[PDB]
A paper describes a structure:
The crystal structures of the two bidomains were determined with a resolution of 1.94 and 2.55 Å for A3_A3 and A3_bGFPD respectively. The structure shows an open conformation but the two domains are in contact: the loop linking the consecutives repeats of the A3 domain interact with the GFP binding surface of the second bGFPD domain. Importantly, the crystal symmetry generates a dimer with a neighbor molecule via its A3 subunit. This dimer is identical to the A3 dimer and to the A3_A3 bidomain protein. For the dimer observed in the crystal structure, two distinct interfaces are observed. The first one is the dimerization interface established between the two A3 domains within a dimer, and the second involves the A3 domain and the bGFPD domain of the same molecule. The dimerization interface between two A3 domains (1170 Å2) is higher than the interface (638 Å2) between the A3 and bGFPD domain of the same molecule. In the interdomain interface, the variable residues of the bGFPD domain are in contact with a non-variable part of the surface of A3. Thus, the interaction between the bGFPD and A3 domain observed in the crystal structure may not reflect the interdomain interactions taking place in solution, for A3_bGFPD, but is rather a secondary consequence of crystallization of the dimeric form. The resulting curve shows that A3_bGFPD is rather compact in solution (Rg = 26.8 Å, Dmax = 90 Å), and could adopt different possible geometries of the closed forms.
Author numbering: 23 to 205, 222 to 406
The structure:
């Protein structure tokens, strides 16, 4: 109930209250706030745009990727660096080519952020752009590319490190020679899913979801019954990114978890997969104790687009939580069947307040 005022305050006229909202959503915000924070990326105030990219990477939702890639072309350097780090935290391979361009940004601190991000994504296409970045005019940028090639650490880098230590000059030689003096991936994290340490398990589910290989589906389904609820919800989000329809039934069981964030993550993942078998469980999830879970129920029903949720969403237009109603109005707009039209004209004349307000709105938009 702290989140929603920050979400409303993101569109406030004053630039200072926008900053305080984006600032606090970077600390508190969850998946409910990326659609408003994606709009905040278009702000007038560079401080707002910066803190927004800061928050979208901290939330780690894959829908911020195409926005943050255009934020890489922002006029403020400190905004481009916040989008670089944010895309590094999301780990989406679509940022690799534009981050390779940011590896040659006019500002030194953006090149550092671009090198870091490509290191955290671990895509091998950055290996030679990072190798040539070892000759950058700025030593701190050279140092960041050395660390970025270390995080990737394929044999493509051992190849380039050997060629560099045999042939290179200056810092690039110092890096490669030390590389030799001190020294596939999806299979390591699957085994890490069964680790005794909780952060290792969590990191494993975080990693397998960004990688997106469907071999990690069955192991992540088993992680849905993990002892810790952070691993449970992480494997749920990972299964949603993977999109494999094998996790549909075990995710529906996750809709009945003790932890509300696990149910919240299970609902969003079932909307990503889009299987209609989620419609019935998600509909009864609109009546959940947790206002977040009620929100993820409506949003997922909007992603699926099944007309069986029309009237449950009309019901949801009178939720106590503000953005649960906001999500329900969005969901009826996505579905938009002939049933939705008939339901909202009844609501236009018989409704009250917010439900009436959005019923009139829907009829206004869908006219031509
Ligand atoms: Na900031």
């Amino acid at each position: 109930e702290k989140v929603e005022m920050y979400i409303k305050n993101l569109q406030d006229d004053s630039y200072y209250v926008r900053r305080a909202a984006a600032y606090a959503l970077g600390k508190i915000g969850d998946e409910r706030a990326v659609e408003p924070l994606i709009k905040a990326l278009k702000d007038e105030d560079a401080w707002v745009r910066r803190a927004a990219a800061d928050a979208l990477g901290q939330i780690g939702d894959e829908r911020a990727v195409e926005p943050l890639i255009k934020a890489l072309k922002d006029e403020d350097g400190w905004v481009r660096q916040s989008a670089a780090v944010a895309l590094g935290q999301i780990g989406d391979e679509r940022a690799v080519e534009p981050l390779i361009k940011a590896l040659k940004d006019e500002d030194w601190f953006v090149r550092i952020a671009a090198a870091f991000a490509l290191g955290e994504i671990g895509d091998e296409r950055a290996v030679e752009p990072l190798i040539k970045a070892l000759k950058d005019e700025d030593g701190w940028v050279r140092q960041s590319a050395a660390d970025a090639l270390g995080e990737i650490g394929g044999e493509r880098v051992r190849a380039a490190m050997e060629k560099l230590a045999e042939t290179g000059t200056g810092f690039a030689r110092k890096v490669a020679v030390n590389y030799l003096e001190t020294h596939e991936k999806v299979e390591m994290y699957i085994k890490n899913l069964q680790d005794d340490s909780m952060p290792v398990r969590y990191d494993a589910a975080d990693a397998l979801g960004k990688i997106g290989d469907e071999r990690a589906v069955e192991p992540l389904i088993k992680a849905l019954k993990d002892e810790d609820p952070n691993v449970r919800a992480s494997a749920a989000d990972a299964l949603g990114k993977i999109g494999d329809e094998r996790a549909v039934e075990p995710l529906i069981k996750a809709l009945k978890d003790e932890d509300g964030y696990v149910r919240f993550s299970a609902a969003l993942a079932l909307g990503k997969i889009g299987d209609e078998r989620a419609v019935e469980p998600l509909i009864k999830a609109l009546k959940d104790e947790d206002s977040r879970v009620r929100w993820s129920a409506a949003y997922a029903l909007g992603q699926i687009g099944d007309e069986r949720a029309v009237e449950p969403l009309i019901k949801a237009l009178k939720d106590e939580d503000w953005q649960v109603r906001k999500a329900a109005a969005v969901a009826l707009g996505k579905i938009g069947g002939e049933r939705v039209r008939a339901a909202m004209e009844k609501l236009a004349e018989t409704g009250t307040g917010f439900a009436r307000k959005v019923a009139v709105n829907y009829l206004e938009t869908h006219k031509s």
